[PDB]
Write a protein that binds this ligand. Structure first.
Ligand SMILES: CN1CCN(Cc2ccc(NCc3ccccc3F)cc2)CC1
Ligand SMILES: CN1CCN(Cc2ccc(NCc3ccccc3F)cc2)CC1
Ligand SMILES: CN1CCN(Cc2ccc(NCc3ccccc3F)cc2)CC1
Lengths: 236, 278, 57, 250, 236, 278, 57, 278, 57, 59
C-alpha cells in the first residue's frame, strides 16, 4: 500500500492522544470502589470559599494577624477600612488563596466573583459598612463620596453575621489575562464606615472582620500553563 | 454495524429589575459551612446575556493529561566503575517538583499510565576523539518487586524471559508503552498518615506504600574505544483519570523525596499598608 | 467497528472516526470529551436544604 | 426554630438550643459495607449500640493566648469503653463518626474558631531529615498544642500554626468538611464524617483515618468579668461500626 | 496515502502482539493428537497438594527428615507442635513447594489456602490436636489460650486419617505482594496438643505427621515476573 | 459480511451459618490421591462475597507468550581466522537457563514460533581508529538438516536458492519472522527417556530428538580496514501454545546444555527450630 | 472480512477490529483471549466419585 | 452512513447592437462615492462570449494559505556565554517584511494556525574538527504569558508539566503542530490606534495588544567537545481565515518591528512628460 | 464517516475522500473550496439604489 | 499492514494541506462576532476605484 510521510512524523508532542501497545497484556485490574468525594472539574474546587489575608501591613510579627481587619469604636465620621486591587491571579492578597492557586495554572479567566464578609465582634456591638467596587479608571477612589458612585452594597450587622458582595463581570473582552497588565485592568474594591461601630459598657473596644473569596457559577479558565510559585535547583 | 455514532456552557445571566421586598439574598451565615449561591442578578439590575463559555479545559482528565518528566540519569558506555555503566531507579513520582505538586492536589487517584522515554548521547571530552562507532542500541527493563536485580552490565538477568523490556536504536522515534492500573488497593494514595508496624513504629508516611518496582537501562553491547555518555528522561502521562478528596495546594518548598518535611513560610507578600492600592 | 462523534468547534460557527487496534482497554486514547460536573457536593454539604432567598437562620 | 437540634445515638442524647445546621461529610451518610465491595470472607461483627454512642473526649481551656489544638482518630478513642476493647481484639475495623464541639460564652465575649476534619493529615518533623516517634503526634485522648513560633525540638512535629504542620496555607483548610463557632450566633459545630480510605477496611491501630483541628482565627477577648477562660469540649460517636478478623488482644 | 509515524515506531517490545510474515510458506503441519493430560492454566497445577518441609531444624543430617513432624507420648499438658509464618512465596517452608514455585513467577496473589495434615502413626494410637490460624498482629501467640482465640479447628484422630484447615482470605487489600513485607503481613499458623497422644503396650513411643499445601478455587495471581531461584554465570 | 462480531471470574463465597450435623467435610483421606475440595464456607461462618478476580494472566498462552533470549554470539567483519568471521549455531532451547526452566515445566508442547533478531556493532580498540565506513548489512540463513553448510564467509552456499534468508541493514527495526510447528512428531518433547540404537545403546536423553537444523550469519560484504565486532541475539516467542503432562519445577542448577546432570541440593533453607516464627 | 470483539476492562466500569493480512495461519497474532479451564483432571483422578460431605471411606 | 457526499465562473458578455436613446450609462457622478457598474456591452457593440474563468485563486483563504518564515535565530551547543546557548523569542508577526505586508492588508483577522519548524546544524570552524557525535535532539517549549522562564540551558523550567513541548531528532521530517484561535478578543488586530493607560499615556500602537507569550529552544543534552551551531526557522500558515475592513497596501519601507514609523516616499516613478508612451 | 466531494478540473473536460482523525476542529485541513463573493458592499455603499441607465443625479 | 513509501515522503511543501495534531487540546475559542466589512475575495478590493497619478512629468 503506497504511502508518504507528512511533516511531523516521529516527533514527540507532550499533549498528543495516540494509542500505544500495552506492556502488561491481559492484566486484571482491581475492582472499582466509590470512595466519597469524587471531583470531576477543578472549578468545583474553585467555587469553595477561603480566607483572604487582607491585612498585609509589612509589620505583621504574627502571621495569623494577616487575616483580621481591625475596627475601632470612635472613628472619623467617614474613614476607609481597607482597599485592594482586583487581580485574583497576581495581587499578593489573592495570590495564595484557594482561588488564586487554581488560576495560576492557567492564562485566561472570566466570570464574576463573590466576596463574603463576616463580623466577629461581640453580640452587643452594631454598625453599618459601605462596600463598593469601582470599575477600571484613571484614579482609585479617595473618599466615600467617590466610592459610592460605583457598584456598592450597604451592610447592616445583625443576627445574620455575613454579607455577600457579588462583583459583576464588566470587561471589554470576553477574557482577561491572569498576568494582568494596564490593558486588562479590573478595578478596585474598598470598604468605608457607613454609620460607625457602637458598643455598650463592658465590651472590648476593638473588633475584627474576615473576608472570603470564591467564584460564581459562570466562572471559567483556559490555556493551561505551568505555575511559577514552585521551583527547585537540584534533584531531590 | 460498519459505523455506530456516539456542549454544557456556563449558566446564562437573566434580566433583573428593581426590587423592594423582605427577601434578603445578600445576607447569609458562613457558620453553617455553606457557600452562598448568590449571583450578580440578585443584587443589581442586569441585562440578559447568553454565555457560550465552556469549562472543557478545567476537567481533571485534561488537567492531568500532559506528559511531564519524572526522572533523568546518566550512564556511560565504558568506565572503570561497574555501577556507573547502568541505571537503577525505584519508581516514584516524588522526584520532580512540578508534577509532584500537580498530583498532590488530590488524596486518591486512579488512572492508566502512558510512559515515553527520551534518550540522547554525547561524546565525552578528551585528548583524542577520532573514532568511528555504528549506531548505539539501548535496553530498558522493568522488574516487578522481588525479582532478580542485575549487578553489572553483562549480568545474566538481562536475558528477560518474563520481565517486559524494550530495545531501542538511536535516530528513531522515542519509545512508548502503556501501563494499566497496577495498585493492590482500589486507588493510588499520595498520602498515608500511618506506620508500617502494628505497634505504631517503623517507617512513617507515603514511603510505606511505594512498592512499584525498579527500572534498569544499559547499552546493549556498545563499548567504544573512548567513553560515551547517555542520558534518559522518563515522562508520565495519566489517562482515564479519577480523583477524590481534593486538598489545599502546597505552600512551602519541597526538601525531601520521601517525606513531607518543610520549613515555615510566610502566608504571602506584604504591602505598605491596608489602604495602599497603587 | 468504527465510532463517529463530533469534535470541539465554536458556538455560532465536524466528525471524526476512531478505531481501536489493541485488545487492552488501557491502550485506548484519552476520553477527554466528558464535561459533566456537580459542585453541590463541596458547596452545599449541609443536611437541611437552605433557600437562598430565605434567611440563613 | 432551626437553632434547636437533638441527636440520639445508643443510650446517649445530645441537645443544643443554639446551633447552626449540620454538615454531612461530602454529602455521603455513613453506611455498612456492601456485599459486592467487601474482600474479607468471614462473617463480620456489628456491636451496634455498645459501640455506636457518644464519648466525651476530655476538655481543654481557651485562653487569650491559645493558638489551636488537634486530635487524631481513631487513636483518640483507643481506650474508651467497648469501642477500645473491640479495636484491640480485631484485625480490621470500619466506622463513620459524628463530631460535636461545645463552646459557650456570654453575649459580651468575642472570638471565632474553625472546626475541620482533615483526612490523611500527614505531618512533617520539626527538623527536616529527622524522624519522630508515635508520641509527638498522638498519645490517646490528650489534645496537642499548635505553636505561634517555629518548632526547634527535633523530637516533635513542626507546630508552626500558619502552615498547619502540613506545609500548606492555614486559610485554605476550608476545602475540607468544616464549620465555624462564632460566639455572636453559635455555641456548637456538628460534622458527620463518613468512612474515607482507599480500601474497604483497615487496621485501626496502624492508620490515622483523619485528624480534627480547632484553630482560633479571631483571638478570644472580654473585659471586666470574673470568667477567666472558656472551656471547650469535644464529643465523638462511631456510626455503623463493624469489625473483622478476631485474634489475641494487642 | 498521507501518514505520520507516532512515538514508539521501530521499537521492539518483548510482550507485543503483531502479525509477521511466515518464512515456510504453505508448510503442512502434522495432524493433532489428543494426548492425555492437557493443561490450560497454571492454577490447575497450583491446586494440587504437595508435601511441606516443616521440620527445618538447622540440624537435619538426613534431608528426608525435614518432612516429618515429631510427636511423643508423654508431653507437657499443653505444648506447641510447630509454628510457621504464612508467607507462601517468601518463607523457606513454602518457598520450594509446588505452590510456592508457581507464585514466584508472579508479583501479586490473593485467595484462600488449604493445609491438610495426615497422621502416620500406629493404628492403635489416638490423640487430639488444635490447629489455629492467627491473623496479623503485633505478637504471635505463645500459649494455647492465646492461639484458641483465632480461627482454629479441633482435630480428632480416628479412621479418617486426614484433616483440612482452610485458611480464610482476611486482608485489607484485594491482593498481597509475593515479596511480602510488614505492610502486607498474613499472620501465623500453629498447632498444639489438645489431649495428648496415648498408645497401648507394644507400640513405638514416637510418631510423625505430614502437611500438604494447596490453593482453593478462589486463588489467583497477577503481574508476571522472572523467578530468582535459577541463575547462571556462563553460557552452557 | 463487511463485519462479523465474535469473563469467567473466580468462584464467589456464599453466606454460611452455624451447623451441627453428622456431615464432616473437614475430615478426608489423602491416601486416595484425591485433593480435598473443601472451601472456607464449610468450616467457619462466612458472609456473601462477589469476586471479580479473573485468572486471565495464568493461562499457558500468556505464561509462555513472552520473548526470551536463547543465544548470543560474536563475529568480526575481518580477521585472520576464517572460522571467527561467521556464526554457526545448532538450534536448541537448552542454552539459556530461564527459558529452559520455563519450558521444562511441561513434558510435551505444540506451538507456533515468532523469531526476532537483535544485532549491534562496535569498533574494536586499537592504535588507529580513524576511518569512514558506510552502513553495514547482515545476512541470516536457515539450513534444514542435511543441507550444505558454508565453510567460509565467501562460500558459494551463501547464494540461497531454497533456504530462506533475511538481509538486514543497521539503523532499522529488528528483523522478525514466523515459524509454524515443524516437528516430525505430534508435539515437541522436552524429555526423552530412551536411547538411539534399538539395542539400548548410543546417545541417551533429549539430545536424540534435536534435529532442527542450523543458523548462519555473516556480514554481506563489509570488510573494514580495521576490525569491527558484531553481536546477534535470538529471541523466541511461542504462539498458539498447547501443553500436556505438567512436571515439578527443577530444583538444582543446570550444568550441561544437552544433559540432565546435576549435583545434589538441600530441599530448602533452615531455621533455628520448629517453633521459631520471628 | 473484519472481526470485532470485546477487549479486557473492569467489573463495574470497548471494541477492537482485527484483520489478517497473510495467507498462513501461523502469521496471526496470539489468541490470548481464552479462559476455559477444568482442574478436576488433576484434583479428582479417582474412579468412584466422592461426595465432600460424606466420609471419605 | 458509510459515506455522505457534499463552479461560479465570471459573468458572461452578451450580444449588444447599435443604440440611440436618452439612456446614458457612460455618464455618472463619482461624487456619490459609488463605483460605476458599466460593462463593455454598454458602450460598444459586442459578441456573445461564454467565460469559464473563475476567481478561485483570489479567495482570502488561498491568498493567505501559504507558509512563510517569521523568525530565524542561532544557538550553540556549547559556549562560555550562558545566554548564547538557547533562544527566547516573544511571538509576533511583525519581524519579517513580506508576511507583515501580506497580513497588514486587513484590519482584523480570525484564523487557525499551523506551525512548522525547520532546524539545521553545522560544525563551527576551528583548528581541530576531528570528532564523533551521535545525532542531536532539540526541545521546543511554549510558555503562555506569565509562566516561568528558564534562565539557563539546564534550568528546572525545562521539565514542562503543563507547557506543551516538542522533542525532535535530526534526520526526520520537520516538526509540525496546530494552534486554534487564542485571542482574548473576537479577532486579531493588526492595528490599534490607542494608548495603554486610560489617561492617554504609556505605550502606543499595536505593541499594546501583543501578549502571545514566548518560545524557547535548546539542545536536549548534546554538549560536543567542539562548538556546534544550530539554526531554527519558524513558519506560519493561517487556516480557516476570515478578514474584515481592507486597508491600502503599505508604500514606505518598514523600519521598526513594533511601530509604524516611516520616511516619506515619492508616490511613484517619473517619465519624460505626460505624452511619452515609448 | 467519510466525505466525498468533487475536485477542481476544467470547463469542457473526479472525486476524493476525506476523513478526520483528530478530535479538534482546528486540526482539519484548509477549506479552500468556497467561492462565494459579493462586491456590492464596497462598490455600492449608497443608501438610495441608483440605476445605471438613469442619470446619476 | 504492509506498506511502501513513495517519493516525496518527509518533504516540507509550503503549499500543502494536511491534518496535524492540536497542541492546545479542547481549547474553547471566543464566540464569533459579525464585524462589519467582511471581505471574502481580493477581487472585491480590486473593483474599487482609486486615483491614478498620470502627471509624472519628472519635474
Ligand atoms: C506515587 N505514584 C502513584 C501512582 N503511580 C502511577 C504509576 C503506575 C505505574 C507506572 N509504571 C511505569 C512503568 C512503565 C513501563 C515499565 C515500567 C514502569 F514502571 C507509572 C506510574 C506513580 C507513583
Ligand atoms: C527443544 N525445543 C523444541 C521446540 N522448538 C521450537 C522451535 C521450532 C522452530 C524454531 N525455528 C526458529 C527459526 C526461525 C527462523 C529461521 C530458522 C529457525 F531455526 C524455533 C523453535 C525449540 C527447541
Ligand atoms: C500579530 N499577529 C496576530 C495573530 N497571531 C496569530 C498566531 C496565534 C498563535 C500562534 N501560535 C504559534 C505557536 C505554535 C506552537 C507553540 C507556540 C506558539 F506560539 C501563532 C500565530 C500572530 C501574530
Amino acid at each position: 500500500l503506497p504511502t508518504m510521510n507528512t511533516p511531523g512524523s516521529t516527533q514527540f508532542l507532550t499533549s498528543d492522544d495516540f494509542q500505544s501497545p500495552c506492556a502488561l497484556p491481559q492484566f486484571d485490574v482491581t475492582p472499582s470502589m466509590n470512595i466519597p468525594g469524587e471531583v470531576k472539574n477543578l472549578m468545583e474546587i474553585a467555587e469553595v470559599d477561603s480566607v483572604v489575608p487582607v491585612n498585609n501591613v509589612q509589620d505583621t510579627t504574627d502571621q495569623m494577624e494577616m487575616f483580621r481587619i481591625p475596627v475601632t469604636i470612635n472613628a472619623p465620621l467617614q474613614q476607609q477600612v481597607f482597599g485592594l486591587r482586583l487581580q485574583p491571579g497576581l495581587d499578593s492578597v489573592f495570590k495564595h488563596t484557594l482561588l488564586g492557586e487554581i488560576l495560576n495554572y492557567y492564562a485566561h479567566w472570566s466570570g464574576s466573583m463573590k466576596l463574603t464578609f463576616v463580623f466577629c465582634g461581640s453580640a452587643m456591638a452594631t454598625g453599618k459598612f459601605l462596600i463598593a467596587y469601582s470599575p477600571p479608571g484613571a484614579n482609585p477612589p479617595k473618599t466615600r463620596k467617590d466610592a459610592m458612585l460605583g457598584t456598592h452594597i450597604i451592610w447592616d450587622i445583625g443576627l445574620q453575621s455575613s454579607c455577600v458582595l457579588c462583583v459583576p463581570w464588566i470587561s471589554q473582552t470576553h477574557y482577561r489575562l491572569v498576568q494582568q497588565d494596564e490593558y486588562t485592568s479590573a478595578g478596585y474594591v474598598t470598604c468605608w464606615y457607613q454609620t460607625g461601630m457602637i458598643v455598650p459598657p463592658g465590651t472590648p473596644n476593638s473588633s475584627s472582620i474576615m473576608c472570603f473569596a470564591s467564584a460564581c457559577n459562570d466562572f471559567s479558565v483556559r490555556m493551561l500553563r505551568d505555575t511559577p510559585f514552585i521551583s527547585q535547583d537540584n534533584k531531590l | 454495524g460498519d459505523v455506530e455514532e456516539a456542549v454544557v456552557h456556563v449558566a446564562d445571566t437573566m434580566r433583573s429589575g428593581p426590587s423592594n421586598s423582605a427577601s434578603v439574598p445578600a445576607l447569609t451565615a458562613v457558620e453553617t459551612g455553606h457557600t452562598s449561591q448568590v449571583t450578580p442578578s440578585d443584587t443589581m439590575q442586569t441585562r440578559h446575556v447568553k454565555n457560550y463559555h465552556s469549562r472543557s479545559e478545567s476537567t481533571v482528565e485534561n488537567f492531568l493529561g500532559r506528559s511531564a518528566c519524572v526522572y533523568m540519569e546518566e550512564y556511560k558506555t565504558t568506565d572503570n566503575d561497574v555501577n556507573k555503566k547502568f541505571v537503577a531507579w525505584p519508581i516514584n513520582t516524588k522526584q520532580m517538583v512540578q508534577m509532584r505538586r500537580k498530583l498532590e492536589m488530590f488524596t486518591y487517584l486512579r488512572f492508566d499510565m502512558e510512559v515515553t522515554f527520551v534518550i540522547t548521547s554525547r561524546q565525552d571530552p578528551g585528548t583524542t576523539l577520532a573514532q568511528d562507532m555504528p549506531v548505539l542500541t539501548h535496553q530498558i527493563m522493568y522488574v516487578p518487586p522481588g525479582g532478580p536485580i542485575p549487578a553489572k552490565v553483562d549480568d545474566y538477568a538481562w536475558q528477560t524471559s518474563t520481565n517486559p523490556s524494550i530495545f531501542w536504536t538511536e535516530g528513531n522515534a522515542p519509545a512508548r508503552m502503556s501501563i494499566p492500573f497496577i495498585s493492590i488497593g482500589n486507588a493510588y494514595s499520595n498520602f498515608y498518615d500511618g506506620w508500617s508496624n502494628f505497634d505504631q513504629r517503623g517507617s512513617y508516611g507515603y514511603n510505606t506504600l511505594n512498592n512499584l518496582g525498579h527500572i534498569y537501562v544499559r547499552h546493549v553491547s556498545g563499548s567504544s574505544p573512548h567513553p560515551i555518555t547517555s542520558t534518559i528522561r522518563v515522562y508520565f502521562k495519566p489517562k482515564h483519570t479519577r480523583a477524590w478528596v481534593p486538598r489545599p495546594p502546597r505552600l512551602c518548598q519541597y526538601k525531601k523525596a520521601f517525606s513531607v518535611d518543610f520549613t515555615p513560610t510566610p502566608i504571602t507578600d506584604t504591602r505598605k499598608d491596608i489602604n495602599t492600592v497603587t | 467497528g468504527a465510532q463517529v462523534s463530533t469534535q470541539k468547534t465554536g458556538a455560532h460557527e465536524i466528525h471524526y472516526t476512531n478505531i481501536n487496534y489493541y485488545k487492552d482497554a488501557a491502550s485506548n486514547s484519552a476520553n477527554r470529551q466528558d464535561f459533566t460536573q456537580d459542585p453541590s457536593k463541596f458547596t452545599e454539604p449541609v443536611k437541611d436544604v437552605m433557600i437562598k432567598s430565605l434567611p440563613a437562620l | 426554630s432551626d437553632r434547636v437540634r437533638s441527636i440520639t445515638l445508643g443510650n446517649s442524647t445530645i441537645t443544643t438550643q443554639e446551633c447552626a445546621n449540620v454538615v454531612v461529610g461530602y454529602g455521603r451518610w455513613p453506611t455498612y459495607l456492601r456485599d459486592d465491595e467487601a474482600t474479607a470472607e468471614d462473617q463480620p461483627t456489628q456491636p451496634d449500640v455498645a459501640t455506636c454512642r457518644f464519648y466525651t473526649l476530655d476538655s481543654i481551656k481557651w485562653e487569650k493566648g491559645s493558638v489551636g489544638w488537634w486530635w487524631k482518630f481513631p487513636e483518640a478513642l483507643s481506650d474508651m469503653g467497648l469501642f477500645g476493647q473491640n479495636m484491640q481484639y480485631h484485625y480490621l475495623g470500619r466506622a463513620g463518626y459524628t463530631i460535636h464541639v461545645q463552646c459557650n460564652a456570654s453575649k459580651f465575649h468575642q472570638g471565632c474558631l474553625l472546626v475541620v476534619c482533615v483526612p490523611e493529615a500527614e505531618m512533617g518533623g520539626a527538623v527536616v531529615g529527622q524522624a519522630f516517634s508515635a508520641t509527638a503526634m498522638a498519645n490517646g485522648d490528650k489534645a496537642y498544642e499548635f505553636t505561634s513560633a517555629t518548632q526547634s525540638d527535633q523530637t516533635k512535629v513542626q507546630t508552626a500554626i500558619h502552615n498547619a504542620g502540613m506545609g500548606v496555607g492555614v486559610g485554605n483548610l476550608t476545602i475540607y468538611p468544616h464549620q465555624w463557632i462564632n460566639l455572636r450566633t453559635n455555641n456548637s459545630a456538628t460534622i458527620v464524617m463518613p468512612y474515607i480510605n482507599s480500601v474497604p477496611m483497615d487496621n485501626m491501630f496502624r492508620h490515622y483515618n483523619f485528624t480534627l483541628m480547632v484553630i482560633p482565627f479571631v483571638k478570644l477577648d472580654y473585659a471586666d468579668t470574673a470568667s477567666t477562660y472558656v472551656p471547650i469540649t469535644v464529643t465523638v460517636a462511631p456510626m455503623c461500626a463493624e469489625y473483622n478478623g478476631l485474634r489475641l488482644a494487642q
